[PDB]
Amino acid sequence: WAIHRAAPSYEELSNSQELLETGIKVIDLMAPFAKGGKVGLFGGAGVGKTVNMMELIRNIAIEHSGYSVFAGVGERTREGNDFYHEMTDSNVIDKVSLVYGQMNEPPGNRLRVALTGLTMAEKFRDEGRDVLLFVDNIYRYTLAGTEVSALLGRMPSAVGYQPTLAEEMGVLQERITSTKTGSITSVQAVYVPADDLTDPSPATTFAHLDATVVLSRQIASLGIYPAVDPLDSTSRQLDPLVVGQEHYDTARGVQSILQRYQELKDIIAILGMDELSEEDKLVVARARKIQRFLSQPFFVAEVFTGSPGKYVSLKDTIRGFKGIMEGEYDHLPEQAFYMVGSIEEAVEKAKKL
């Protein structure tokens, strides 16, 4: 197939707004994915980006019947080599296609690699599957388009970007949708220049993202994996009108508890635990249980933990956090929730812990 096409027409788009059940407790609760949405991974390396990517590849291949495509736009050849070995030594390699644009290739190569991945995902969609497309950096697509535009000699725009910036982003992002035959969901790594969210590259990209997952060095320091931050990760699928009122209330609830805990943890830092009332101690206790219970063992992580991996259905996450928030399970200790699985598995861990 040719790499260049128009997006789906208005009558081809899906007349519904389904969710994707990723299987990960933090994501499916706090930052649910629309099927056919765009997700931004706003974390630096050090934090599990690739293991999270491999876990999604596994769950969508096993627990659905989807394939994945990975597009390495402007990747260091070294990381390209050892991402391939980490996938081959984890049996996920048979369920993903790899297209790599190594940085040592001329600019025109790097720009078009993003479209090569997208056309392969369009084939798997046309076969009727639901597909994941990973883009290894969307910022490097933008910069490849700037460099090519400068070589062609067109007048620059904005903060020196190409004049076609918003069009070239739109030409990519509008092909990634849910149709009436299948869908392509995308997970895109984002780099923000100068830490500036006002710069045209972030400002153009954030118009297209639906969900936003932030990975934290601090949460990894706690040993909590996956290292998603529940307070800065967000999704515009969290509304009662699309996700329903039980899920909305539960996600709003755990956000409120974790925020209040952060303030209480500053009060504890300056003045110790003696300042807390019984209500405050109950809030701190449940917040620690909620924090523990956002951990999960992946089928990809068995190499380290040695525990068998778990896939958790959305209902089971809603039951678990409903339980912990309303003070059931207050009678069993917080380490019963860590790395366990379902809340039914947490109590069975507790019984001999």
């Binding site: 208005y10 725009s157 004049p163 069009e167």
Partner: protein, 342 residues
């Protein structure tokens, strides 16, 4: 993500019965979003009263740049026949970017923030067609087939601004073309104050001439009282100096803001709004807890829907404020406050 679109389509839906035709122009939006908006317009039955004009983010920049001019030309048909229409432009900032692309591909020397100087002329000639015309223009245009009516086209342009900066170029160009602005603040929206309208910035140059008498009289200084309450809260956070009237000013402002938040897709008629404003400013929310304010209204609008329905039908027909109606409103609020629970 501040509710700009939600506010505009809820305006469209409330004209579903008011006899004003609606037009929605989507420039550079996602096709998924556009199909979901159309499906929400149809879900509420407004769709039969709207024209929808689409230029998706995938389409050539010229189609985006000419998209709002095409929408204006359809809206002018109703205006010149002496009917009323309402037009939404879903992002004029995205039109300016598309014109900047075409203008720079034609090598035209850029100005501030790289837009051409023609960018004022672009948005000027568009918006300056949203007008009201006298009956002699409608008669002369329609060759006398319509007598004595006056047509209008009402425009609600949307601008997205970076980090809330109201002092960037294109925002300041359009603020200088329109008759006012509604400024939506992310700090209020994140605090759950929705719709997140910031008073003091927001204004309507046309003024009360746009209100019905009852709404004009019952609203009054509520804007400037909210702006001052927000400023007083800023200094009150900083030090303790509470002098009773400050305490009551803070309580009133906090109850009014808790009374002004409202749910999406739940529009309420002028009779309902005038009761709510009457209850706020005649002091009836005294003895009422903040956590009870939302309950207090829901019970009150059910109470007046149940028993004193004929007045509602009167105030919705003619928005007339009399001492007779004020007396009936006083009796309704006196009896509800005394006799009912929430």
């Amino acid at each position: 993500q501040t509710g700009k679109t939600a506010l505009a389509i809820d305006a469209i839906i409330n004209q579903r019965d008011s006899g004003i035709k609606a037009i929605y122009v989507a420039i550079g939006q996602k096709a998924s979003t556009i199909s979901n908006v159309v499906r929400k317009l149809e879900e509420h039955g407004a769709l039969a009263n709207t024209i929808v004009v689409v230029a998706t983010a995938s389409e050539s920049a010229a189609l985006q740049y000419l998209a709002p001019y095409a929408g204006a030309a359809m809206g002018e048909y109703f205006r010149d026949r002496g009917e009323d229409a309402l037009i939404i432009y879903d992002d004029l900032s995205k039109q300016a970017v598309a014109y900047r692309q075409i203008s720079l591909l034609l090598r035209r020397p850029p100005g501030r923030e790289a837009f051409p100087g023609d960018v004022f002329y672009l948005h000027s000639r568009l918006l300056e067609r949203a007008a009201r015309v006298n009956a002699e223009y409608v008669e002369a245009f329609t060759k006398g087939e319509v007598k004595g009516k006056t047509g209008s086209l009402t425009a609600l342009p949307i601008i997205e601004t970076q980090a809330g900066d109201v002092s960037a170029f294109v925002p300041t160009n359009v603020i200088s073309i329109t008759d006012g602005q509604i400024f939506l603040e992310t700090n209020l929206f994140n605090a759950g104050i929705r719709p997140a309208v910031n008073p003091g910035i927001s204004v309507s140059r046309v003024g009360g001439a746009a209100q019905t008498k009852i709404m004009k009289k019952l609203s009054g200084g509520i804007r400037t009282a909210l702006a001052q309450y927000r400023e007083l809260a800023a200094f009150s956070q900083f030090a303790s100096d509470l002098d009773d009237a400050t305490r009551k000013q803070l309580d009133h402002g906090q109850k009014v803001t808790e009374l002004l938040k409202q749910k999406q897709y739940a529009p309420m008629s002028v009779a309902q709004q005038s009761l709510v404003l009457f209850a706020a400013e005649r002091g009836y929310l005294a003895d009422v807890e903040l956590s009870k304010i939302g309950s207090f209204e829901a019970a009150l609008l059910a109470y007046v829907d149940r028993d004193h329905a004929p007045l509602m039908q009167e105030i919705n027909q003619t928005g007339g404020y009399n001492d007779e109606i004020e007396g009936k409103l006083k009796g309704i609020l006196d009896s509800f406050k005394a006799t009912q629970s929430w």
